[PDB]
Design a protein around this ligand. Structure first.
Ligand SMILES: Cc1c(C)c2c(c(C)c1O)CC[C@@](C)(CCC[C@H](C)CCC[C@H](C)CCCC(C)C)O2
Ligand SMILES: Cc1c(C)c2c(c(C)c1O)CC[C@@](C)(CCC[C@H](C)CCC[C@H](C)CCCC(C)C)O2
Ligand SMILES: Cc1c(C)c2c(c(C)c1O)CC[C@@](C)(CCC[C@H](C)CCC[C@H](C)CCCC(C)C)O2
Ligand SMILES: Cc1c(C)c2c(c(C)c1O)CC[C@@](C)(CCC[C@H](C)CCC[C@H](C)CCCC(C)C)O2
Ligand SMILES: [Cl-]
Ligand SMILES: [Cl-]
Ligand SMILES: [Cl-]
Ligand SMILES: [Cl-]
Lengths: 228, 228, 228, 228
């Protein structure tokens, strides 16, 4: 069967030395952040999901990557903390990493930063920013093939300035900032598969969020299994 | 007669040490890429030529450089591979290098990247990208005086990011990206000589492609001679 | 045209550094042995040829190598010296090296040492032995793919002991000693192409010698051209 | 055919390392002095030739060297510059170097310095003097076997003092100064072949100059070929 080791091998192109280091950092990072990784049961973040914060596209991008969508406007920082929000991505990642094609072709994430407030950045402490850079680089068995930021306000760049120093040059090359006129540039990266709200043709974000919410709730037994 | 050595001397301004190194890399590169350079007979790429992928201007630029035109939209990656396409440039280069004035004044190439798809970049592997940088720098007796990219889509820069690390600073200075509004900037570099499709006045790309296709087919005996 | 340089490139697999060194040794060796290489006109060794000392097979071996045959019994050391005999091989080599397929696939030589006397070895001085090793290794643009010694007497090994210290390990691997029962082992290396005297089926050594003698005499104008 | 390389090999006794260095300096020197070597067409110096400045003996010296004669009195420094005069020697050298026997036996030059004025030395700048020493030593594929100065005035030694520091010891050994009573000493070096004006028996300098002038004008097509 697809062993737990196999996802780490594929993430590092069957370089046993590199895959081993990634495995070490995976356990290390999970140990230094139990407030995110100790309990992966969707119980603590179901409110976030039903608020419409997160969803995953059905179809893959032209290179076979899984496409993830985050909407920061649907995150209420008064209700959920940065750790809660982080846990959502962690939960999704632990699920999609089971897909062999995702293991081979990595993922791409889209962040709709419309509605980013000063109530969001306060949650993003230096410790949090470094943990963000960790999972983006060499602490989780997922190839980050691209990060796409749209509708990012001027005040956000201060937040990104906290993450960038801990980023490898490879990942920095893969982070895109589109601004408010994102639609044309975003459609080139993701043809046919985007939802209606982002220039897409068929499905809406509400449907996509609901579907992924169901899948997470459905996978609640597996998410408990990998909890320590 | 214009010896085979003479083209290497002129390419390095009669610096015998440098011209010798270029000769060494010329044979080395040809040995490490037989899937491109072993057989230069136009047989394997005649379909590409008649598709309208490549053509050479009759008139030289204001500095005497030969001007080459490539249209990526006329490359069907399902039919022809990157090696096939590479072979086209190799064939053209082996022909125009016979011109003494081309030896002295180098070449300039225009790439119409309109229609660049994710089906094109998949062909461009790290090994291919490094071979591209090789012939652009110090592995073929042709001075690359300028590379002009027009209509380049957003997704192309990821491909260029694979080539750039292997490029010398001199060549990087000579690579131009014009975007969609290229016509004004392109006409300044190439007055009077451009085809109709790119702001020109007289000839069309279809004529230019056909003429160069005829010349290549006509030179099929010479191209077989230099095959190993 | 097939330049004089090209034979040196092919001899060293288009390694310009190595091919250059071979060219240097080619001129050096020719300069330190004018009593062999100054005059390559068949005048001085026509008697050797008509005595039946040397011949070249029409057909190539299974790998495309030219096959050369020497019969030491037809060398009268009282009439011709070691330098005269050496000149024969030099003349043949300068002729067969013009064949592109010989340049690519190298040569193989068969020495019938039947009749090797103490009047032959006296001619083989330490200086001569070292010159033999020179052309076998890195002083002539011919790949020596194999040397086959048959009917070698016990007293010959003393002579070979003079050559061996100056031989590279590569060439030593390619020197074969078959003894008196050579026919079976020799036929495995050279199927279908051997003459009647050595297990062959069709042609005789006398015919083969005469044919190569004619060709050398016919090429007398070219052999004068390369004389210094 | 006698390749362009072959003249450099013979000039350095088939020492490939040394012949290669001479080739490098040949292109270097030609690049640092285009005001002498860019255009070798006899157009710019035909007046010098018809003035009777230069001629070449028909017969070779006892060692087979080509013998060149220069008469400084027939150089009008008001009309022709040092570069023009230098070009004459360059033109002659590029012609006589085609002779295989000249390649093997080198050249000898005779300078009649009778009439050397202070209007001649002003043309001989430090830069010019060093260029003179360059072609005399290791920058042109011609063995300088001897330089003979006759009728040299006292004021000339200041000019020679500018050249001597850049001369190798070998060439310095081969430079002879005869003075006004040169005839006896000059006849020992050049028996039977000298013109009437220098103790000769048959031909006059006017005939010799005219003959070489015709040959240069006749070779005007070749001299254009080697121009860059
Ligand atoms: C394995 C994996 C994880 C675990 C992951 C992400 C990706 C691509 C992964 O492959 C992306 C998002 C992230 C880092 C969660 C981020 C948590 C914070 C609270 C998000 C809100 C504010 C961010 C400042 C917005 C920008 C984020 C991008 C710069 C990644 O969690
Ligand atoms: C001697 C010589 C060769 C041999 C040559 C070129 C030039 C200017 C030369 O002087 C330019 C084109 C190239 C490198 C062939 C490229 C092959 C690939 C398949 C082209 C399609 C995709 C490219 C990623 C498009 C961008 C190319 C530019 C950045 C050069 O082949
Ligand atoms: C380029 C080239 C030359 C020039 C050449 C040979 C080969 C294979 C070449 O590729 C083989 C023969 C040789 C060395 C001539 C040998 C001269 C002596 C006189 C031969 C008689 C006695 C030899 C002791 C017999 C054994 C020779 C083998 C050990 C090669 O000349
Ligand atoms: C290949 C070659 C060249 C190119 C050459 C010469 C020789 C022997 C060559 O082999 C001799 C003459 C020279 C150097 C041209 C000299 C130019 C000047 C203007 C001559 C007039 C004044 C000289 C100060 C007179 C003395 C010259 C000797 C000391 C050589 O050009
Ligand atoms: Cl972008
Ligand atoms: Cl530009
Ligand atoms: Cl054997
Ligand atoms: Cl003297």
């Amino acid at each position: 069967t697809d062993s737990f080791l196999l996802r780490f091998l594929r993430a590092r192109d069957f370089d046993l030395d590199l895959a081993w280091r990634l495995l070490k950092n995976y356990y290390k990072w999970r140990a230094e952040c139990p407030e995110i990784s100790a309990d992966l049961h969707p119980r603590s973040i179901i409110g976030l999901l039903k608020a419409g914060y997160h969803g995953v596209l059905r179809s893959r991008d032209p290179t076979g990557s899984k496409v993830l969508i985050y909407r920061i406007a649907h995150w209420d920082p008064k209700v959920f903390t940065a750790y809660d929000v982080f846990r959502v991505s962690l939960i999704t990642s632990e699920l999609i990493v089971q897909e062999v094609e995702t293991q081979r072709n990595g993922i791409k994430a889209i962040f709709d930063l419309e509605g980013w407030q000063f109530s969001h950045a306060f949650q993003i402490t230096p410790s949090v920013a470094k943990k963000i850079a960790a999972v983006l680089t060499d602490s989780f068995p997922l190839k980050v093939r691209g990060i796409h930021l749209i509708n990012e306000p001027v005040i956000f760049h201060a937040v990104f300035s906290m993450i960038k120093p801990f980023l490898t040059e490879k990942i920095k090359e893969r982070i895109h900032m589109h601004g408010n006129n994102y639609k044309q540039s975003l459609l080139q990266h993701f043809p046919d598969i985007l939802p209606l709200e982002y220039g897409g043709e068929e499905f809406s974000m509400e449907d996509i969020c609901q579907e992924w919410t169901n899948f997470i709730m459905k996978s609640e037994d597996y998410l408990s299994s990998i909890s320590e």
